[PDB]
């Protein structure tokens, strides 16, 4: 294990866990939790960033002195990837954009970049690679996001045969777009749902569950070439889910059906924003698509994680979306939503 990489201490901030991890995509929603969980145990974390260093400041207190190293990288450059994965025994890939920018389409962030990372980290002698795809990744899906996810999953498996591939479904948390998107809709007046959300089933998963699952998969010797699906303990119809979201936020729920072509036109209209779009056509397709059921894949309970129900963590995301009148309401006051389980 190369004596310098032998675990020491009580697993705390000043300990040595034996992990040296390069976390691509550490400046996003999932990346902050992953870096927090790695730096809790005393891991050496290498953060490749392309954004303004100001935007990485929140990751500085996550480690001890010298335990977090920040390095500039370019997704189209392989010498840069070599530079940032030279000394790591773990590489985690969390790179991904919900919308397509002018310089990066879905195929760049979900096929080219993951494949380049897998190839370079295999060349460099990195022991472990963790890749994140979607639960609904499919070659013939109506969303190009998921088509690119499936293609990139195959490419990573080809470039790094012993990679662990993790397939979560609709992560929810404080900085999660999925919980926020429903909350955001209240400003307009009515909630537009295709078929009133009666033909969609969702199985959202907690952010901390996904971070813990990644961390445990790193420490698991038999999780090498496996493929995991990270899903929550409950399945909801989209209508009931959005109704529960609006009840926790104490906002008046006014759902109305909107036809598919009208919603696609709205998404296209919102797509022309030079900044982060409020919604896109791809987001509209992904929202009203039912979560797949994959019983043949190992889950969070195979990694020792007990999935957190949304009923226990919804208030910590949605209390910010309340008015002053309902700001002090307790968690058990909202009557959990109806689950369509089996």
């Amino acid at each position: 294990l190369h004596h310098a990489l032998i675990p020491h201490g009580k697993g705390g901030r000043s300990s040595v866990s034996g992990i040296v991890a390069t976390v691509f995509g550490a400046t996003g929603f999932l990346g902050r939790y992953v870096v927090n969980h790695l730096g809790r145990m005393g891991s050496q974390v290498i953060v490749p960033y392309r954004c303004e260093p100001y935007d990485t400041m929140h990751l500085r207190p996550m480690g001890d002195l010298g335990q977090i190293i920040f390095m500039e990288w370019n997704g189209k450059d392989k010498d840069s990837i070599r530079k940032v994965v030279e000394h790591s025994n773990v590489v985690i890939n969390l790179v991904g954009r919900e919308w397509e920018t002018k310089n990066f389409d879905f195929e760049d962030v979900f096929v080219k970049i993951p494949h380049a990372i897998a190839q370079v980290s295999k060349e460099a002698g990195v022991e472990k690679l963790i890749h994140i795809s979607h639960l609904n990744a499919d070659i013939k899906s109506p969303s190009r996001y998921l088509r690119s996810k499936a293609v990139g999953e195959k490419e990573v498996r080809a470039a790094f045969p012993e990679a662990t591939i993790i397939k979560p479904s609709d992560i929810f948390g404080r900085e999660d777009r999925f919980l926020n998107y429903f909350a955001s809709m209240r400003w307009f007046g009515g909630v537009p749902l295709i078929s009133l959300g009666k033909e969609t089933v969702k199985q959202p998963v907690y952010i901390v569950d996904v971070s813990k699952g990644i961390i445990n998969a790193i420490k698991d010797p038999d999780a090498k070439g496996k493929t995991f699906a990270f899903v929550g303990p409950n399945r909801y119809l989209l209508f009931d889910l959005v109704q529960y979201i609006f009840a926790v936020a104490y906002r008046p729920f006014l759902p109305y059906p909107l036809p598919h072509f009208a919603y696609r036109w709205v998404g296209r209209l919102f797509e022309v924003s030079p900044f982060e779009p409020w919604t896109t056509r791809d987001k509209v397709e992904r929202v009203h698509m039912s979560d797949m059921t994959l019983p043949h894949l190992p889950g969070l309970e195979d990694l020792g994680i007990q999935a957190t129900p949304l009923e226990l963590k919804a208030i910590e995301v949605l209390r910010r979306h309340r008015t002053y009148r309902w700001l002090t309401s307790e968690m058990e006051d909202v009557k959990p939503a109806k689950t369509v389980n089996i």
Binding site: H8, S14, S15
Partner: protein, 125 residues
Amino acid sequence: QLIAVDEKLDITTLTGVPEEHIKTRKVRIFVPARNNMQSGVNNTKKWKMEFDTRERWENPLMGWSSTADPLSNLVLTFSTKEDAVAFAEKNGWSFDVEERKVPKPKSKSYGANFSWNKRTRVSTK
């Protein structure tokens, strides 16, 4: 007014020590040995209580010596072994006591260096 409490003294629930550092610890009650590099005996007068040595590792940065043991530096001084034992008992620590070792009285005689027939005679001086 006196109430005649009948039980053994026990203050663990008031000290605020985490239970891990109450049950898994072993203290040593002893009179420290004289440092063999010197002849003074002034450091062998009082009893000492000290805890068991825990893990120390190397800091990845700078290579300093890191510990996670909060009692790794604590040393208590007592007049007599009975006081040390009473303190350890009322604080709930398992202890090991060692009886004080004193140097035995030795019969010195300068004239023996020049014995008429004895082996003690010095070959040099």
